[PDB]
Amino acid sequence: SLSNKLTLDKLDVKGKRVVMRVDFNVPMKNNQITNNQRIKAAIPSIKFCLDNGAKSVVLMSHLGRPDGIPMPDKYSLEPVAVELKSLLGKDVLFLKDCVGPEVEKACADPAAGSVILLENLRFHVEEEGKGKDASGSKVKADPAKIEAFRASLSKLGDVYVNDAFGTAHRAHSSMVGVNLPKKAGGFLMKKELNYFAKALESPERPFLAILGGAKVADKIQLINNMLDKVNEMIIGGGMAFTFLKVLNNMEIGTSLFDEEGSKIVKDLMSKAEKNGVKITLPVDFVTADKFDENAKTGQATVASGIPAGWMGLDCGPESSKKYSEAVARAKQIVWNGPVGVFEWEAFAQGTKALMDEVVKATSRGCITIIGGGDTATCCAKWNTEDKVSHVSTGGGASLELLEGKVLPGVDALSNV
Ligand SMILES: Nc1ncnc2c1ncn2[C@@H]1O[C@H](COP(=O)(O)OP(=O)(O)OP(=O)(O)O)[C@@H](O)[C@H]1O
Numbered sequence: 001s002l003s004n005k006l007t008l009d010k011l012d013v014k015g016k017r018v019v020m021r022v023d024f025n026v027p028m029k030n031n032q033i034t035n036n037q038r039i040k041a042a043i044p045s046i047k048f049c050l051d052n053g054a055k056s057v058v059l060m061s062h063l064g065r066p067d068g069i070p071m072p073d074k075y076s077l078e079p080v081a082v083e084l085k086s087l088l089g090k091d092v093l094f095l096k097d098c099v100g101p102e103v104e105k106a107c108a109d110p111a112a113g114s115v116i117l118l119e120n121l122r123f124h125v126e127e128e129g130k131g132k133d134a135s136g137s138k139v140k141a142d143p144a145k146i147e148a149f150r151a152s153l154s155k156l157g158d159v160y161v162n163d164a165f166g167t168a169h170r171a172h173s174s175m176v177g178v179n180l181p182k183k184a185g186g187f188l189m190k191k192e193l194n195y196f197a198k199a200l201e202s203p204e205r206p207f208l209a210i211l212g213g214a215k216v217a218d219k220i221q222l223i224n225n226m227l228d229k230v231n232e233m234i235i236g237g238g239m240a241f242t243f244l245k246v247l248n249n250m251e252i253g254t255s256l257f258d259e260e261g262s263k264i265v266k267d268l269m270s271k272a273e274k275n276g277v278k279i280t281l282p283v284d285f286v287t288a289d290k291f292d293e294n295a296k297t298g299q300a301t302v303a304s305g306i307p308a309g310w311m312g313l314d315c316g317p318e319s320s321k322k323y324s325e326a327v328a329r330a331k332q333i334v335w336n337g338p339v340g341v342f343e344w345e346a347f348a349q350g351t352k353a354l355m356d357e358v359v360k361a362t363s364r365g366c367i368t369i370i371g372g373g374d375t376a377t378c379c380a381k382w383n384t385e386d387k388v389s390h391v392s393t394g395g396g397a398s399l400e401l402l403e404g405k406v407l408p409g410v411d412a413l414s415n416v
Pocket of ligand 1: 212213214215236237238239256312313314335336337338339340341342343371372373374375376395
């Protein structure tokens with residue numbers, strides 16, 4: 001049960017040193033942060049600790065993909081420290097490393113109310129347990145060193161708090177190796193577990209899942225698992241052309257086709273019928289003569305087929321109507337993946353219209369949950385982050401949750 005894990009509000013931090021794992025993997029264009037959304041997201045957890053008398057808050061996170069070797073020139077968290085200070089209003093001590101006697105000493109007895117940010121955990125191959133040398137050759141971490149790394153991290157605080165849901169699907173040292181008597185989820189993690197608990201433990205009904213994306217094969221377990229809990233499912237995006245070709249014998253031109261996935265489609269539909277799940281597929285499409293932002297546009301339906309040399313990049317007006325009718329009946333919605341190439345405005349209208357409908361549903365009480373990744377980015381583009389119930393901060397992690405797997409980082413949390 002994701003609802004029985006220990007969270008920050010139920011943890012006494014008065015006079016305690018708090019070692020907190022956060023998600024500060026922010027976007028950078030070299031010498032500056034373009035989006036500080038992730039940083040602003042951690043603030044509530046940090047302020048809570050400081051406001052509740054914590055002795056200190058030690059922040060650890062990763063940035064980019066260093067792959068096990070120090071790359072301060074490219075992926076140092078120093079810029080984040082400066083950005084965090086402006087947002088928190090308090091000084092932030094940035095340390096050039098995350099482990100060692102020097103670091104342990106700075107954290108052994110800091111000035112009350114201190115906020116410390118350690119350097120990129122991934123500068124050490126012991127965090128991921130694997131990496132690469134300067135030559136690009138694969139290097140596997142040494143067990144004894146992994147032990148020493150985790151023992152060091154464990155010395156930086158008295159209680160452990162995990163607010164990095166985006167990395168919880170990884171058995172990395174900072175996720176499962178900090179040995180402290182209290183391991184609690186932070187406020188962001190609390191939200192992730194509370195909403196996905198609904199999507200998998202006790203959802204409101206009807207429960208509709210909107211599944212988009214391009215590939216089918218890598219989404220087989222997700223669909224399989226969702227078919228065990230939903231009442232209705234919209235299958236859109238590039239994904240639908242595999243379904244439409246197999247079941248309807250539709251001519252799809254040069255639209256995405258998943259040979260692997262195509263062999264399991266009838267079986268998925270079969271399970272859908274056995275469970276009484278209503279499947280809604282697109283009936284019309286916006287086509288393009290090439291996969292490009294400026295391609296020529298056309299229109300097509302399932303009956304007309306798609307011209308040779310053309311591909312479906314978005315659903316048409318008739319599909320949007322059907323999609324909106326499904327949203328209308330639901331009391332709960334989980335949406336993972338865009339219904340078209342939302343990166344390009346000409347093919348983002350299908351996705352935008354659905355977002356509008358989902359926001360409207362939210363206003364009347366619908367529990368709307370948006371998965372991480374692209375779809376999550378959609379909410380940032382049209383500024384609807386505050387118009388839905390929950391926007392997941394973990395792309396790959398939210399996917400593994402929806403698949404029915406146990407997240408190592410969630411599993412390691414203390415139980416209430
Ligand atoms: N009809 C289509 N043809 C080709 N590509 C498409 C189509 N519809 C959507 N896409 C592309 O699918 C990509 C997303 O697919 P992918 O399987 O990678 O992720 P996803 O399941 O949508 O996850 P997320 O929730 O992160 O969006 C987007 O970049 C989008 O441009």
